[PDB]
């Protein structure tokens, strides 16, 4: 029954959206996480015309978003961290600027600079393997 | 819950009971019928034949078959199973034969086909053999040293020294009724006539010819089945 | 009719509970005494000061649900079969204290007070009651 | 189900016990009873033949396997006959290279050994028959009694079987004088023992009982229903 | 274990009524023997099956209603309304209440007694008729007695709830109480109540 | 919710040492919480206790309910691995409620139950959330019986949680002795009897193996023939116990 | 808000997420409110489409707390404690930053931690001569707070058996003796 | 009581080629409708009776008053006082007045009640909610035997069943045999259950009742036992009657453990539909049958010996039925000579009668696709590939 239900609010919002009756002037917006699951019914043009993936930033980006971020942050090598090479999402540069911040806090110092900064970017990215070594 | 030992014959319940094997005895009252009864005389088989269709030959199915002329053999179970028990009785008889030009008794018969029998869970099946319990229950009848001699042979391997046994679909009500039937002074006419009347009381149909199915085996003669015309002698007087 | 709330002549309210409508917390009528109201009995009130009016049992009849309806069943000991064990335990269990109380009494055991017959539907469990109903001399009682 | 762990005879249980072997403990008591007293000069196994209709003869329960040793089954058929089998073909070869009678500790021994393997490895079913074990040797005559745990035990005397607590306190009840009794007041002992597992019902008749002898100048030789009929003779009457 | 199972729903209506109170003009009594209640000016006794005793013995105990005076004499019984008039009987004693009970506006003229007579006139049920009685009322300490010889003592005492009202003079009320239509069982009446004031 | 279940420590048996250690555990703190404050310390909020399942786990708890002539509840492991959850989403907060309001209570949880797979975690915590969701001074008790000590979780026989721990062993020959003589107390049963004899001859047989052999052997003494109650129907009794039934099998030597 | 995960998931198809829904607008509605999520790995372990009916009602609380903790209605004033013992298992969505801000390994006790959590621990009990944290250290090493706390319980317990009105080194030695043997 | 109902008119189709047999024995029946409607209209042209009584009837409907709410005589008390719900739910202590026929009172039958002061002023022995009304036939459906292709055991089964015990019963008492009180009929969809429960309502001599099963289930609390006993109270009434409830799996599912309130209603309603159909006993006049497709998914109590004894398989049709349903429903065609239809039977497949029902219309619309109405073998060709949509080609050979 439980799956029956789920589906049947799929099924449902599949006909409200390009069903019998259209609808005008009414754009919705669904997000997810993992598109590739998602029914293709949901996935077809006339509901959904536009896909956008949305990657992790990609060095220019990730410049953009370090300066969007630190725009509130204090005067503070921003572009050297841009260039290092890590799948980070702009949600990962948002901590790595808070937890910057919080460090500078702890220290009591009103200006982050390489050593407190540095130190917040180790902590975000950890990405610490603890894999044995026989898988690779 | 009893389903968890019912899966291979090497689990044990906790009565300590064998389930695979209790179902290959259930599995012969799939089978027909088979009435063995043992007098001073001798000793008789008589077997239904379930027919299925008119077209059937007879002799194809083979409700009694005989190991030896001095020994008879009845069966109720896998007629592919019976086949097989009955091949290997008929070989170690042949086998005795070979070793000491002799005819052995029937009980010799039922301790070599129960050796082949409960070998299931034996190691020795490694170039191939039964891996679950054989599925026919046996009928030896015969006349050796000890004069007449019945037994009757369990898939277990169970064998007893039997007066008169019923195996098969209607084993209980036909054993239930040769208890009072028998008795020891039985004589051999009167003996077959008493199993034609529990096979006609026990039978789902009337009794003809094509039928019953009929062994004798007496100290004089061998083995001797009922021909057409000796059936129908039989089978006129009931 | 709900729990009592410990009248003892001084706190004579009672919660009922009129159906599918609310429940009440209430008090008596002059005209019926605190003996004859007790938890759990279908009571008529009056409609705005809710006061027990009249208690209403619910009547007894074989005419209405369906009951015992059998005195002397016509089921003898020659109508049940399949069960010799199981009508020789009946026995044991009604027969016996019934019938010959004496040996029981002189055995200074007290007789079963409870028994309990369990199987698959349709082994003929009511009928062999019925059946030791008919040769007990006792009346047999069917509740569903 | 947290009852997983009985299924093989190769799994522990939780508190630390293989439930299958406790399984095919519980197996042979199924069968029939049977009791084996010994003298100072000689053994008897008492058994109680049961047959499965009245019909046909009964089981035999005492099987011979060399002059001086005889066996008594409780249990499996399947599982006995392959043991039975066994014993005689280590006989066989005993007596063809060494010319001597096979020791009793010996062959019991042998039997320990054989039994443990199904009960150690995966594939056949552990042995689940009670062995009754009477036999002579330089010590005279022996009792052992082989569980299907693949252990043995030596003892005075021993009932294996249904309802086998009855003769079990019977023999501890009558232990003081088994020591000194000669074949008759023995025979008769082992009979009241058995006696004491039969309900009142049934008594020890001529084919209900089967009874193997052995000792130092006599062979094991089992007798039937005519030749137990002397040993029956001196049997008293049921205390009822 | 995985169940995750939806659930429906089936609503019970519910909803009732309180309906106008209904007046039950009740007498209760337990004169002799018997607790009977009887409901009314037609009567039916309720409960207390055919009397004992004979029904003249309690048809004088019978608000709403009063007798006809003339504009001289003082109508203490018009006046003393909308209240009414709360009466003391002496015959057995009987008394008017007025009560909430339930939901049944209770007029109960109560009813009780002693003293019956093994052989009393009162319950072998012989009745020829009540001749027509005089009633003196005047008051004696601030209550108004009515002095009536039972013709076929009677004490009465009427009491006000407005305490205001003014006490009429020593008149002579005659009333004419005879039982109009009645059953042998009595148990289906019609009583009468005719009485006129006198100077 | 059971408040007398009639039991004077007259009807249990074998069972000293335990009950010594219940008392102790239960009715001293209860009865001298005084001393236990004058130790500085807090009594024990929970008594886990453990054995066979034929060792009469109840009985005793029944027989402590009766010694303190508190009030008894009683609830059930097997019982709540079922009907999904709820389990101490509305029950075991609504039974340690019904005993905190009808004081004095002596709540029970028997038999061992498991301490997909995620029901019987919410319910230990609730189990144990409420076990610690209560008043400190501890004026009703919890009595746990379990089948096994096998599965353990360390929050529940943690300290606080179930501190006392009460060991059930097989019942010996004098146990035996003493619980058929008991159970017998109701009968007219003639000393020529050897209860001691009987006591040796039920190995294995720990408490309810009793209720077996004893009550059994007073119907069988009614199925004797009204028979006054000697041994002629006590080792018959003793003989069939739960094997009374006979197989009757073939195929086996 | 003291919220224990395992006890939210129920039977009953959308009412687990529905219990997460009230509890953050009872935490909006009375702020300063501290969400304390205890074992979270019973709700957030991990999305995966294997498709069972259970574990996919487990996904859609997930989601339904990561919407109410990071989602579109900014949250102010509300801050979440998450504890658990497998946190290796909970999903990448709720890992990420935005959420869970910080991962604080609260790990087992060192040398110097055990010693402090037994001198602290040691205040309510009363003291008669001598008792050395040092020696219950190097006796109770692998031990994880509360079991030291059980040490001293049993203690004043193990006081009763000879019946003092105190506790001696001996019964310390004794009774974290019991504790670590009962922790095999 | 009572007596059954279900009238319907002439069979006629005795001829249909349209020959004016067919218009000779219609204008017969068209003739007598035209006489029925003209002696009612006469007779209501003229019928001056009525008054009489007049002021005893008035003064008791002036004590009825105006409205009168109907309730359920739920129980009785001495015999001037009831207790009567009103549909509503909620039932009350009333009094009983004269006028009523004590006789009639009994547990079940609708009271008229006052709508003030209630108090059971009459008694309707009709009642009859307006689904129940609608679930009893009044037409009877054109299907009959005749339309039926094979099944003859089928039918012979639930003649025997439903038709024997209203025909001449005596052979069921002379063996002795109980009459088979309720048939279960079942099998794969469009077998033909629903049209043998047509032609049992064609060729019927009792009330036939109509159910979908799914019916029963109502929304408010305690509506759905209601109903059925208002359904099984009408079957009793008008008996003999036949009770047909289609469907039976929309109830009929295994019994579990209820867990919200609306599974606990439909458990009661089952339970309802259980205890009423052992209420009456077998002996009675009234006989329910009861059609589904999922029969392992029925309560293993429904189909009881002690409730539904019989259980009557709608096989898929065999070759010899394939071929006398394409008869029957070929037999309104105008097929040409060169048509066979063996090609069709002959083909393994898994036909049904709804499956060849169709074939034949897509035959015909094939047909006149090609403007044609002769109907030729290929218009069947086509057509059985067009409705038959949807073991691995060579693997079995
Ligand atoms: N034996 C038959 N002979 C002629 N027509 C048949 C036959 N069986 C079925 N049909 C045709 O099938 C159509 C549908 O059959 P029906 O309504 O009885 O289905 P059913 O088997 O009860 O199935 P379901 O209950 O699953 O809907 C009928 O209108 C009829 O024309
Ligand atoms: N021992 C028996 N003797 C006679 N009839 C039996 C017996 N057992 C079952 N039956 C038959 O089974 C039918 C149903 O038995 P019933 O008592 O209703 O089953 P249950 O025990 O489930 O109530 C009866 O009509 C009866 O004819
Ligand atoms: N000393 C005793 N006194 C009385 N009854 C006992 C005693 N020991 C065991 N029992 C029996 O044990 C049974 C209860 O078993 P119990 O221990 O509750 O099982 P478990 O531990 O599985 O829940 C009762 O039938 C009871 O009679
Ligand atoms: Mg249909």
């Not at chain 2, 019976?82 to 000491?100: G, P, S």
């Not at chain 4, 089954?73 to 001597?100: H, K, P, W, Y």
């Not at chain 8, 609390?221 to 799996?249: N, Q, T, W, Y």
Request: proline share 5%; hydrophobic share 35%.
């Amino acid at each position: 029954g439980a799956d029956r239900e789920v589906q049947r609010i799929l099924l449902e919002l599949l006909n409200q959206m390009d069903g019998f009756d259209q609808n005008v002037n009414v754009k919705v917006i669904m997000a997810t996480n993992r598109a590739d699951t998602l029914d293709p019914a949901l996935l077809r043009p006339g509901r959904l015309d536009r896909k956008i993936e949305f990657p992790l930033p990609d060095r220019r980006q990730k410049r953009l978003i370090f300066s969007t971020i630190t725009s509130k942050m204090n005067l503070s090598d921003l572009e050297d961290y841009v260039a290092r090479p890590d799948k980070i999402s702009g949600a990962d540069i948002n901590s790595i600027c808070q937890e910057s911040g919080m460090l500078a806090v702890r220290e009591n110092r009103y200006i982050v600079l390489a050593k407190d900064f540095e130190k917040a970017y180790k902590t975000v990215i950890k990405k610490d393997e603890q894999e044995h070594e026989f898988y690779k | 819950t009893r389903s968890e030992y019912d899966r291979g014959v090497n689990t044990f319940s906790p009565e300590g009971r064998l389930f695979q094997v209790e179902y290959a005895i259930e599995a012969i009252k799939l089978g027909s019928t088979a009435i063995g009864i043992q007098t001073s005389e001798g000793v008789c088989l008589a077997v239904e034949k379930r027919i299925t269709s008119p077209l059937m030959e007879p002799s194809s199915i083979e409700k009694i078959v005989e190991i030896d002329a001095h020994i008879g053999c009845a069966m109720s179970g896998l007629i592919a199973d019976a086949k097989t028990l009955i091949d290997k009785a008929r070989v170690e008889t042949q086998n005795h034969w070979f070793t000491y030009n002799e005819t052995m008794t029937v009980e010799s018969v039922t301790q070599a086909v129960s050796n082949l029998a409960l070998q299931f869970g034996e190691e020795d099946a490694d170039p191939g053999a039964m891996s679950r319990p054989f599925g026919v229950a046996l009928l030896f009848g015969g006349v050796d040293e000890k004069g007449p001699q019945l037994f009757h042979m369990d898939p277990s391997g169970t064998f007893v020294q039997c007066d008169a046994r019923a195996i098969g679909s209607a084993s209980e009500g036909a054993q239930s009724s040769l208890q009072e039937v028998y008795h020891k002074s039985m004589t051999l006419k009167e003996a077959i006539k008493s199993s034609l009347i529990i096979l006609k009381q026990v039978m789902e149909e009337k009794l003809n010819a094509t039928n019953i199915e009929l062994a004798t085996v007496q100290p004089g003669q061998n083995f001797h089945m009922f021909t057409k015309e000796e059936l129908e002698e039989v089978i006129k007087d009931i | 009719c709900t729990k009592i709330i410990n009248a003892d002549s001084e706190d004579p309210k009672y919660i009922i509970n009129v159906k599918q409508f609310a429940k009440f917390v209430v008090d008596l009528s002059d005209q019926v005494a605190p003996t004859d109201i007790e938890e759990g009995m279908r009571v008529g009130v009056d409609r705005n000061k809710y006061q027990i009016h009249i208690p209403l049992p619910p009547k007894i009849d074989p005419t209405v649900t369906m009951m015992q309806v059998e005195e002397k069943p016509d089921v003898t000991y020659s109508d049940v079969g399949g069960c010799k064990e199981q009508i020789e335990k009946l026995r044991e269990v009604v027969e016996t204290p019934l019938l010959h109380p004496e040996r029981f009494v002189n055995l200074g055991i007290e007789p079963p007070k409870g028994v309990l017959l369990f199987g698959p539907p349709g082994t003929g469990k009511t009928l062999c009651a019925r059946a030791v109903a008919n040769r007990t001399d006792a009346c047999f009682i069917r509740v569903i | 189900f947290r009852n997983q762990y009985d299924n093989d005879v190769t799994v522990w249980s939780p508190q630390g016990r293989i439930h299958q072997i406790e399984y095919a403990m519980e197996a042979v008591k199924q069968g029939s009873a049977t009791v084996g007293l010994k003298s100072k000069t000689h053994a008897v196994l008492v058994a109680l033949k049961r047959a499965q209709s009245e019909l046909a003869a009964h089981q035999k329960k005492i099987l011979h396997v060399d002059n001086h040793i005889g066996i008594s089954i409780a249990g499996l058929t399947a599982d006995a006959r392959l043991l039975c089998n066994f014993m005689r073909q280590e006989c066989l070869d005993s007596r063809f290279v060494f010319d001597r009678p096979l020791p009793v500790s010996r062959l019991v021994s042998l039997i320990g050994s054989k039994t443990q393997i199904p009960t150690q490895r995966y594939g056949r079913r552990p042995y689940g028959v009670g062995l009754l074990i009477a036999g002579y040797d330089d010590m005279g005559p022996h009792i052992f009694q082989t569980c299907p745990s693949a252990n043995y035990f030596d003892c005075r005397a021993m009932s294996i079987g249904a309802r086998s607590q009855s003769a079990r306190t019977y023999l501890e009840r009558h232990m003081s004088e088994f020591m000194e009794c000669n074949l008759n007041e023995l025979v008769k002992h082992g009979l009241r023992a058995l006696r004491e597992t039969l309900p009142a019902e049934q008594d020890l008749t001529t084919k209900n009982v089967s009874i193997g002898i052995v000792g130092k100048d006599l062979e094991f030789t089992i007798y039937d229903d005519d030749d137990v009929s002397p040993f029956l003779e001196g049997l008293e009457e049921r205390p009822q | 274990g995985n169940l995750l199972f939806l659930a429906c729903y089936c609503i019970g209506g519910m909803s009732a009524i309180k309906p106008d109170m209904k007046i039950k003009l009740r007498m209760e009594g337990n004169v002799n023997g018997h607790h009977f209640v009887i409901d009314g000016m037609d009567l039916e006794v309720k409960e207390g099956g055919p009397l004992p005793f004979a029904f003249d013995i309690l048809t004088t105990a019978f608000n709403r209603v009063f007798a006809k005076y003339p504009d001289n004499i003082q109508d203490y019984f018009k006046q003393s309304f909308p209240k009414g008039y709360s009466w003391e009987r002496s015959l057995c004693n009987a008394r008017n209440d007025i009560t909430m009970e339930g939901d049944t506006f209770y007029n109960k003229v109560r009813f009780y007694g002693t003293n019956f007579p093994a052989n009393g006139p009162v319950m072998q049920k012989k009745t020829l008729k009540w001749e027509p009685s005089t009633e003196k009322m005047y008051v004696r300490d601030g209550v108004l007695t009515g002095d009536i010889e039972m013709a076929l003592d009677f004490r009465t005492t009427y009491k006000a709830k407005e305490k205001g009202v003014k006490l009429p003079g020593a008149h002579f009320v005659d009333h004419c109480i005879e039982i109009l239509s009645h059953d042998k069982d009595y148990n289906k009446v019609k009583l009468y109540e005719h009485a006129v004031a006198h100077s | 919710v059971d408040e007398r279940p009639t039991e004077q420590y007259s009807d249990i048996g074998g069972l000293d040492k335990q009950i010594q250690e219940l008392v102790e555990a239960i009715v001293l703190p209860m009865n001298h919480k005084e001393k236990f404050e004058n130790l500085g310390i807090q009594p024990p909020k929970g008594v886990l206790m453990y054995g066979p399942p034929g060792t009469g786990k109840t009985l005793l708890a029944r027989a402590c309910a009766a010694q303190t002539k508190a009030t008894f509840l009683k609830l059930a492991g097997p019982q709540l691995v079922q009907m999904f959850i709820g389990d101490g989403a509305k029950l075991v907060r609504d039974a340690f409620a019904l005993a905190k309001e009808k004081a004095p209570s002596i709540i029970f949880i028997d038999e061992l139950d498991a301490i997909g797979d995620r029901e019987v975690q919410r319910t230990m915590l609730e189990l144990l959330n409420q076990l610690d969701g209560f008043q400190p001074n501890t004026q009703v008790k919890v009595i746990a019986a379990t089948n096994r000590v096998d599965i353990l979780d360390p929050a529940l026989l943690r300290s606080g949680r179930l501190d006392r721990k009460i060991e059930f062993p097989m019942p010996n020959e004098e146990a035996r002795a003493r619980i058929m003589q008991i159970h017998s107390r109701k009968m007219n049963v003639s000393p020529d009897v050897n209860y001691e004899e009987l006591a040796r001859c039920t190995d294995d047989f720990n408490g309810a193996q009793c209720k077996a052999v004893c009550v059994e052997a007073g119907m069988i003494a009614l199925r004797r023939g009204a028979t006054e109650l000697t041994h002629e129907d006590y080792m018959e009794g003793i003989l069939e116990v739960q094997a009374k039934k006979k197989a009757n099998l073939q195929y086996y030597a | 808000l003291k919220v224990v995960s395992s006890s939210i998931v129920d039977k009953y198809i959308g009412e687990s997420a529905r219990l997460i829904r009230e509890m953050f607008n009872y935490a909006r509605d009375h702020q300063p409110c501290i969400i304390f999520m205890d074992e979270i790995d019973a709700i957030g372990g991990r999305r995966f489409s294997e498709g069972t009916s259970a574990d996919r009602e487990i996904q859609r609380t997930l989601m339904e707390l990561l919407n109410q903790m990071d989602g579109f209605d900014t949250l102010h004033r509300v801050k979440m404690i998450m504890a658990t013992n497998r946190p290796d298992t909970l999903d990448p969505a709720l890992l990420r930053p935005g959420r869970l801000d910080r991962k604080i390994h609260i790990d087992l006790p060192n040398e110097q931690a055990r010693l402090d959590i037994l001198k602290i621990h040691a205040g309510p009990i009363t003291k008669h001569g001598e008792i050395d944290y040092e020696a219950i250290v190097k006796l109770s090493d692998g031990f994880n707070g509360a079991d030291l706390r059980n040490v001293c319980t049993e203690a004043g317990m193990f006081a009763i058996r000879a019946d003092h009105d105190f506790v001696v080194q001996e019964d310390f030695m004794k009774a974290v003796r019991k504790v670590a043997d009962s922790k095999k | 009581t009572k007596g059954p109902d279900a009238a319907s008119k002439l069979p006629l189709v005795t001829p249909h080629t349209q020959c004016r047999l067919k218009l000779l024995k219609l204008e017969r029946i068209k003739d007598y409708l035209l006489m029925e409607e003209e002696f009612i209209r006469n007779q209501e042209q003229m019928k001056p009776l009525e008054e009489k009584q007049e002021e005893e009837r008035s003064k008791v409907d002036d004590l009825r008053g105006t409205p009168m709410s109907v309730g359920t005589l739920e129980e009785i008390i001495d015999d001037n006082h009831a207790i009567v719900s009103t549909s509503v739910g909620s039932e009350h202590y009333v009094s009983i007045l004269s006028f009523v026929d004590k006789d009639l009172l009994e547990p079940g039958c609708s009271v008229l009640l006052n709508h003030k002061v209630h108090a059971v002023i009459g008694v309707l022995m009709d009642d009859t909610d307006p689904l129940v009304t609608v679930m009893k036939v009044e037409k009877a459906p054109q299907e009959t035997y005749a339309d039926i292709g094979g099944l003859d055991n089928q039918i012979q089964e639930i003649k025997e069943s439903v038709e024997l015990p209203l025909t001449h019963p005596e052979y069921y008492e002379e063996m002795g045999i109980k009459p088979p009180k309720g048939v279960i009929l079942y099998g794969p969809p469009g077998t033909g259950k629903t049209l043998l429960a047509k032609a049992v309502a064609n060729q019927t001599s009792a009330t036939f009742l109509r159910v979908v099963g799914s019916e029963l289930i109502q929304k408010y609390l305690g509506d759905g036992p209601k109903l059925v006993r208002e359904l099984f109270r009408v079957a009793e009434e008008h008996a003999p009657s036949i009770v047909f409830i289609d469907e039976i799996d929309a109830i009929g599912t295994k019994r579990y453990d209820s867990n919200s309130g609306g599974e606990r209603e439909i458990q009661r309603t089952m339970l309802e539909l259980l205890n009423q159909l052992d209420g009456f006993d077998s002996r009675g006049d009234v006989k329910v049958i009861m059609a589904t497709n999922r029969i392992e998914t029925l309560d293993p109590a429904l189909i009881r010996p002690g409730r539904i004894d019989r259980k009557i398989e709608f096989p898929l049709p065999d070759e010899k039925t394939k071929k006398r349903i394409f008869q029957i429903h070929t037999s309104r065609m105008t097929l040409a000579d060169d048509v066979t239809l063996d090609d069709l039977i002959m083909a393994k497949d898994d036909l049904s009668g709804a499956d060849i029902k169709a074939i034949c219309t897509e035959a015909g619309l094939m047909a006149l696709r090609e403007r044609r109405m002769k109907v030729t073998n290929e218009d069947f060709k086509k057509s059985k590939e067009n409705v038959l949509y949807k073991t691995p080609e060579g693997l079995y050979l």
